[PDB]
């Protein structure tokens, strides 16, 4: 601790005093993860392998719920020309645990795959399919010559070159405003058909259902651990909770917008999160020019966590507690002060307010001074400071 203060002061000599120098904080011992123990596997492998994709004229919509997903096998696959995510990382998708997923499928020109990003502008965006600004998901696309290109032009695929008003995000509607693509294997890649699938997740504000492959683990209570419930992740000590959650509630939110209670996803159990113990650490030290001894005060946390002495200000370690009061040297708090005294030790004690005295009062007695002393008292007052500019 003494050297901790020395660094904190950027000095090799530490004058007598009490210095705040660090923060005691309990590290977690193990990591606990909980997820709803569903067995179903998600049907993603089918949306990427459908015989016929839709066209932005009537772009196709599919919804995913109640299943376990694995996006690593999809991200690493070779067929996918572009796979870019917004509001979430491609590798992380195995860590989160969602309420629902929307998969939108369509075909589009290769030149127009630049036009699908969220908040982007262009005819395929404002007239066919607009992604909003608040989009959180992944855009996926790959060239599809052998699927959606054929001799004579695959006229089956349509799009809108004009509309009387720009689209609201995720809207669909059904001179003439429509035109078909000229998908011929002879045509250049920019005009070749690209199959595009857009996955928009709904992050958890409710019981998550489309959720990652992470293995659930049996939990523990009354011990600071890392916890992860449906992707709600943090560190703290779990305990049984007396809060009466309504059946549709998943977690309790505190004044500081932090989750103080969570429902175990695989049980009706309701658990309370407590940020496991922490506090400030101060160093009660006499002048290094007098002694290298030292004592440590852990503020606001008592001694079963970190001689040892418990005080209203915190847990004091190193200093020795003695019950006889002094004009107190180093102020610890709540009447306790510390000092260094000759064995040589740091004593801690309740301060003395002053010498106890009683005036000899009576209804007929008065004391009068017979002599006097002239006293010269110093009083130093700062009048100004350096005129810095």
């Amino acid at each position: 601790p003494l050297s901790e203060t020395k660094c904190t002061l950027k000095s090799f000599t530490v004058e007598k005093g009490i210095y705040q120098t660090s923060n005691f904080r309990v590290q977690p011992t193990e990591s606990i993860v909980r997820f709803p123990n569903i067995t179903n596997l998600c049907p993603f492998g089918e949306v990427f392998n459908a015989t016929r994709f839709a066209s932005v004229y009537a772009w196709n919509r599919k919804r995913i719920s109640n299943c376990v997903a694995d996006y690593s096998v999809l991200y690493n696959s070779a067929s996918f020309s572009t796979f870019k995510c917004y509001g979430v990382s491609p590798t992380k998708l195995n860590d989160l645990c969602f309420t629902n997923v929307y998969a939108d499928s369509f075909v589009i020109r290769g030149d127009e795959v630049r036009q699908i990003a969220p908040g982007q502008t262009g005819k395929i965006a404002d007239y066919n399919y607009k992604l909003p600004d608040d989009f959180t998901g992944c855009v996926i696309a790959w060239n599809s010559n052998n699927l959606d290109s054929k001799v004579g032009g695959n006229y089956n695929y349509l799009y809108r070159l004009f509309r009387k008003s720009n689209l609201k995000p995720f809207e669909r509607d059904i001179y003439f405003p429509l035109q078909s693509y000229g998908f011929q294997p002879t045509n250049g890649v920019g005009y070749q058909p690209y199959r595009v699938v857009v996955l928009s997740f709904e992050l958890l504000h409710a019981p998550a259902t489309v959720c990652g492959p992470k293995k659930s683990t049996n939990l523990v209570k009354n011990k600071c651990v890392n916890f992860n419930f449906n992707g709600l992740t943090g560190t703290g000590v779990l305990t049984e909770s007396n809060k009466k959650f309504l059946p549709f509630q998943q977690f309790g939110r505190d004044i500081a917008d932090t989750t103080d209670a969570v429902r175990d996803p695989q049980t009706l159990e309701i658990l309370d999160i407590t940020p496991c113990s922490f506090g400030g650490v101060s160093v009660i030290t006499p002048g290094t020019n007098t002694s290298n001894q030292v004592a440590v005060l852990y503020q606001g946390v008592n001694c079963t966590e970190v001689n040892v002495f418990q005080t209203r200000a915190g847990c004091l370690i190193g200093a020795e507690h003695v019950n006889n009061s002094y004009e107190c040297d180093i102020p610890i708090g709540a009447g306790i002060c510390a000092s260094y005294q000759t064995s040589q030790s740091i004593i801690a004690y309740t301060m003395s307010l002053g010498a106890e005295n009683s005036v000899a009062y009576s209804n007929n007695s008065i004391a009068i001074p017979t002599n006097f002393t002239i006293s010269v008292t110093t009083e130093i007052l700062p009048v100004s400071m350096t005129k810095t500019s």
Binding site: A360, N363, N364, S365, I366, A367, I368, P369, T370, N371, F372, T373, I374, S375, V376, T377, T378, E379, I380, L381, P382, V383, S384, M385, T386
Partner: protein, 122 residues
């Protein structure tokens, strides 16, 4: 202004004890006042009374306190023991002496009567 250019009647403003005077001194970015103060010391107990009933009239001290050294009564200034004889000019009078609680019987000396006797002799 108040301690150096004058004498401060405010207690504990210009140092502990009764303020006599002060002296300023310069200091780097500051001023040091040397407060010369008067501190009483070596006190003694004394029995006391609020007033004295002499002729049936209650006598009070114009300044100071009535203090007895055990067998005699004197009037002495408040802050320094200097026992003076209780004269009709060290004191004043207000009415009958049954109205004051704690009054004490004693005589108050009058400087005129010796002159009266001296003239009567001559």
């Amino acid at each position: 202004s108040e301690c150096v250019l004058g004498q401060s009647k405010r207690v504990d403003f210009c140092g502990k004890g009764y303020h006599l005077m002060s002296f300023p001194q310069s200091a780097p970015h500051g001023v040091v006042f040397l407060h010369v103060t008067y501190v009483p010391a070596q006190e003694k107990n004394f029995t006391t009374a609020p007033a004295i009933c002499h002729d049936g009239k209650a006598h009070f001290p114009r300044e100071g306190v009535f203090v007895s050294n055990g067998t005699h009564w004197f009037v002495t200034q408040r802050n320094f023991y200097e026992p003076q004889i209780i004269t009709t000019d060290n004191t004043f009078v207000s009415g009958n002496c049954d109205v004051v609680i704690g009054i004490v019987n004693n005589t108050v000396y009058d400087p005129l009567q010796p002159e009266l006797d001296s003239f009567k002799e001559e």
